Amino acid sequence: EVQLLESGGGLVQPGGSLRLSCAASGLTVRSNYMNWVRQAPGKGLEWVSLIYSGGSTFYADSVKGRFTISRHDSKNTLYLQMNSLRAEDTAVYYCARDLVVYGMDVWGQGTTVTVSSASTKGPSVFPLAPSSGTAALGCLVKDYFPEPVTVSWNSGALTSGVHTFPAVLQSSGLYSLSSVVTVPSSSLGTQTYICNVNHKPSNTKVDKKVEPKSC
Amino acid sequence: NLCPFGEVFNATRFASVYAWNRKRISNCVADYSVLYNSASFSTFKCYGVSPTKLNDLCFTNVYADSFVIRGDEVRQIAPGQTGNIADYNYKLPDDFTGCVIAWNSNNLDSKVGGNYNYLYRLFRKSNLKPFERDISTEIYQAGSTPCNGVKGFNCYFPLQSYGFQPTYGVGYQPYRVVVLSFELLHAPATVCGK
Amino acid sequence: DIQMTQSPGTLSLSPGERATLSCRASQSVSSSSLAWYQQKHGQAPRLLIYGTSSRATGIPDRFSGSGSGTDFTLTISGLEPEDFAVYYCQQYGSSPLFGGGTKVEIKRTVAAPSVFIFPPSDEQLKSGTASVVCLLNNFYPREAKVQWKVDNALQSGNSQESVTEQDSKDSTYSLSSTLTLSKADYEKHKVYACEVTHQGLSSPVTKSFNRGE
Ligand SMILES: *[C@@H]1O[C@H](CO)[C@@H](O)[C@H](O)[C@H]1NC(C)=O
Ligand SMILES: [Cl-]
Ligand SMILES: [Cl-]
Ligand SMILES: [Cl-]
Ligand SMILES: [Cl-]
């Protein structure tokens, strides 16, 4: 049973530091080429750092002078010390054993690093009220930090036609998503619709009724 | 009589970098005029001594090491370097006194379909010491389970081929390298420049 | 420096069809230095192929690699539903370098979106901000253009978009765009519109409202 178990990711502010750990089993970190590969949200894979069994280390230009890869032979663990963190360092970080010509055959599950100067903040839930066949209504979950939030409708009884969109990061440093549902227009005046928004990082639970807007 | 630098530079075949060759040059008159007067050398860097000053110095023994690497790896044949070649194949000392000479040999060492005769060690547990030569082909153990000379998971053949093809970019084309080490040992000198 | 380029960015095929994924290098490289990776949504990458054409351990026979020099190809014979993911090639010089990735999605017939526009709620206006939301619902393909218009002026620089994953039931996409203004700026205009262009629409569809009606 081969496994790379990563940990250490979490919330950090820009300029701060953070150290990731990659506990291996089924292979000897001291004996291998080891890499760190990161993936910013929505974007591709990026190689970050490499260490030889012989001890030589190599780094991507975007992290040189700030990151340090290292290991602990006894603990069979690979490390990544990240200093002077920046918002663009926000990503999922994977460790992988590297066989160069034979590829990176063993990967970890990843650990998430979020770099921001924002403070924990619950969302404001605004209605997306239908216009006066099928109607659309929704909830705007605006201005919260950090991720994630969960949005259900009618306490999980309404799932058909629901789209909960990926959040966007606004220029304020706060996230903002929308969650909509399409329904037959006949049921606007007979069925109540309530979105259930949960923001665990702040223990914020909001139930917002969405009704047509009367003049 | 003269030093046989021609047998090394003009050799019809070079060695793989992992099993690099060494020519021990002693008791002869060496002329470093012709070497620097050539125009076929893409790399000619000296460390600790000027290439025109060598015709004025005497050394106990001169060593000519030769091998083939790919274009992008030539930069590792220098003091204070890291990488697969410098760490696992051919390591120069931090106080290296000598010259490093190299030239593109794509016309000699690459074949259409690939010349798989040139190899380099890809897996090694720790770094070579300066002027160490590891010619082992033991299966490399990458985990806690011993390999017993059988390939498999965590058990890999340590050598890899270059497969030089002439259509490769220059970074992947073969380069012949000669490394001249001037050993100023403490014994009656034998190789002077003239 | 070397630069890797994958094309197309998105491959649209049906299950059972053959996928051909390209990877191009800016200089001619040894075939032993090129590898392929699969990444399904929400999972870590896994190695498919090393040395251009060597299939890794446990990878199904339907995956195969080929190419040399500057052109490299990943071929998936007989696509399976589990095979609709992103695929990265990787060139190994002195360090690994990944291509941008290629998404392999499910092909379906063109479906025009339903467009809905939502004015900002009175609760948000008291806070001093106005978010206007445009919803494009269950369309295919993913390429869609949302143009915000404020009193018929084309807006740029004050909207953000977000797209759902391809739907498990109908294989469509949905998009929502948010136009964000200050309450003061919002109060200075009357007609708010989003104009949607899409392959399923023969002419751009506009949904609009008048502030305060
Ligand atoms: C190698 O051969 C060429 C061609 O005959 C000759 O000009 C050159 O001097 C030779 N080099 C050495 C070091 O003998
Ligand atoms: Cl609220
Ligand atoms: Cl020396
Ligand atoms: Cl073998
Ligand atoms: Cl209004």
Numbering used by the authors:
A (entry chain A): 1 to 132, 138 to 220
B (entry chain E): 334 to 527
C (entry chain B): 1 to 213
Question: What's the publication's text?
Answer:
Alpha-B.1.1.7, Beta-B.1.351, Gamma-P.1, and Delta-B.1.617.2 variants of SARS-CoV-2 express multiple mutations in the spike protein (S). The RBD mutations found in Alpha (N501Y), Beta (K417N, E484K, and N501Y), Gamma (K417T, E484K, and N501Y), and Delta (L452R and T478K) are located in or closely adjacent to the ACE2-interacting surface where they have the potential to modulate ACE2 interaction or disrupt the binding of neutralizing mAbs. To understand this, we generated 674 mAbs from Beta-infected individuals and performed a detailed structure-function analysis of the 27 most potent mAbs: one binding the spike N-terminal domain (NTD), the rest the receptor-binding domain (RBD).
H1-3 all contact the RBD surface in the area between, but not touching, residues 417 and 484. It appears from the relative rarity of IgVH3-53 mAbs in the anti-Beta responses, that the mAbs selected are private rather than public. The continued, but much reduced, usage of the IgVH3-53 gene family is due to a shift in L1 abrogating a blocking interaction with Tyr-501 bearing RBDs and joins the use of a rare mutation in L1 documented previously (Dejnirattisai et al., 2021b) as a resilience mechanism against this mutation.
